[PDB]
Ligand SMILES: CC(C)CCC[C@@H](C)[C@H]1CC[C@H]2[C@@H]3CC=C4C[C@@H](O)CC[C@]4(C)[C@H]3CC[C@]12C
């Protein structure tokens with residue numbers, strides 16, 4: 001037999017034929033192509049009903065729908081065999097409604113749900129979703145506005161990338177989500193099929209992982225720029241940074257593309273306003289769930305590890321005697337310590353060390369040593385990098401942990417039909433709603449964590 005989705009397409013392809021067709025020959029043939037697909041789809045076992053036996057009332061209630069669809073196809077096929085062109089055109093038109101009730105709800109991306117029509121009505125809020133979305137977009141546009149005045153840094157390139165990623169994220173997902181709330185989570189209304197749902201899943205993983213990986217990219221710019229000599233050859237550094245952003249996006253799209261390649265699955269999630277990786281126990285669902293959570297988690301982890309070391313370096317260096325770093329191995333010459341093993345007792349100013357003194361780490365001369373200059377720009381960026389890091393810690397980590405736990409749950413978290421408890425269905429929505437805040441708060445870390453803001457909003461205290 002053929003996949004329910006393949007038959008679903010056949011039924012649409014032919015429904016579109018009958019619509020534009022002018023004679024009963026084309027109409028009859030398109031309806032003949034329909035009937036076999038409906039008969040084929042009846043032999044199929046939807047994923048939504050994997051745990052049911054064929055004898056099951058849930059299973060025969062499914063097969064009866066195809067009896068009804070075939071019944072209508074035959075009712076229209078009788079009219080096409082009558083030569084009644086306009087009549088057969090109309091009888092096949094009502095099949096659009098019929099296919100939604102008997103095929104569309106069993107399509108792959110549709111997991112089972114015990115959410116009543118009543119629950120959907122009150123949960124449906126397009127105007128609030130729109131409001132939140134607009135707030136998110138405005139914020140991001142505001143960050144880019146501020147960025148436009150400020151900027152050439154490798155840091156700022158990633159910050160721009162992260163603000164731009166957040167904006168498109170809120171705009172593309174927001175639009176889907178608002179439409180769903182406007183359509184009371186009835187997918188067929190917006191787009192019949194699993195295509196929009198699958199697109200939404202890829203978009204979710206893309207805009208999920210991207211702000212996390214770019215957050216980690218920023219933590220690495222700070223780490224290298226602070227630990228290694230503060231040599232900022234912009235244009236090159238900005239190219240290296242935009243290229244990294246592009247790789248970050250490519251890697252984030254490539255992972256969002258895995259459920260399409262059969263590693264994982266995109267299915268509609270409670271309340272029905274969005275799609276995501278399926279939180280199942282299936283080998284793929286586990287591999288993809290952990291891949292996503294491990295990557296986001298490691299991104300936030302690595303961001304913490306690096307940032308603490310960069311702050312540790314900024315605090316040690318931006319305090320005390322005039323430190324000079326080796327521009328070959330980064331060795332920070334601390335007058336405070338000296339090099340007593342090489343006759344430079346503690347308290348020796350760099351200006352007081354002889355030429356016949358070499359770097360105790362790499363061995364290069366005093367000529368290859370640069371003065372460590374205190375820059376408020378380095379402080380401003382370190383603050384924004386920590387701010388971005390804390391935002392991701394607070395918003396993303398709960399969801400990332402939740403995903404990995406759900407996927408690794410001792411008694412399976414998901415039923416064989418693909419159903420989740422309404423507590424886990426709610427937990428995920430709450431955890432996702434939290435993650436949404438990272439895309440709203442990242443532009444504000446840039447807007448607020450600035451030396452000019454500190455200055456203009458100083459006499460408040
Ligand atoms: C130009 C370079 C950098 C590569 C980017 C190509 C992008 C835009 C393309 C290539 C393959 C595309 C995907 C192919 C298949 C599907 C399945 C469909 O149900 C929803 C959209 C979705 C998810 C597409 C989204 C966009 C996509 C990821």
Ligand SMILES: O=C(O)Cc1ccc(CCNS(=O)(=O)c2ccc(Cl)cc2)cc1
Nearest residue numbers: 169170173204207208273274435436439
């Ligand atoms: O309230 C609802 O109806 C449920 C719901 C809320 C918000 C969205 C999309 C939020 N967009 S986002 O902040 O860019 C984002 C967030 C997480 C990821 Cl993994 C990727 C992108 C979807 C569904």
Ligand SMILES: [Zn+2]
Nearest residue numbers: 326329359362
């Ligand atoms: Zn050195």
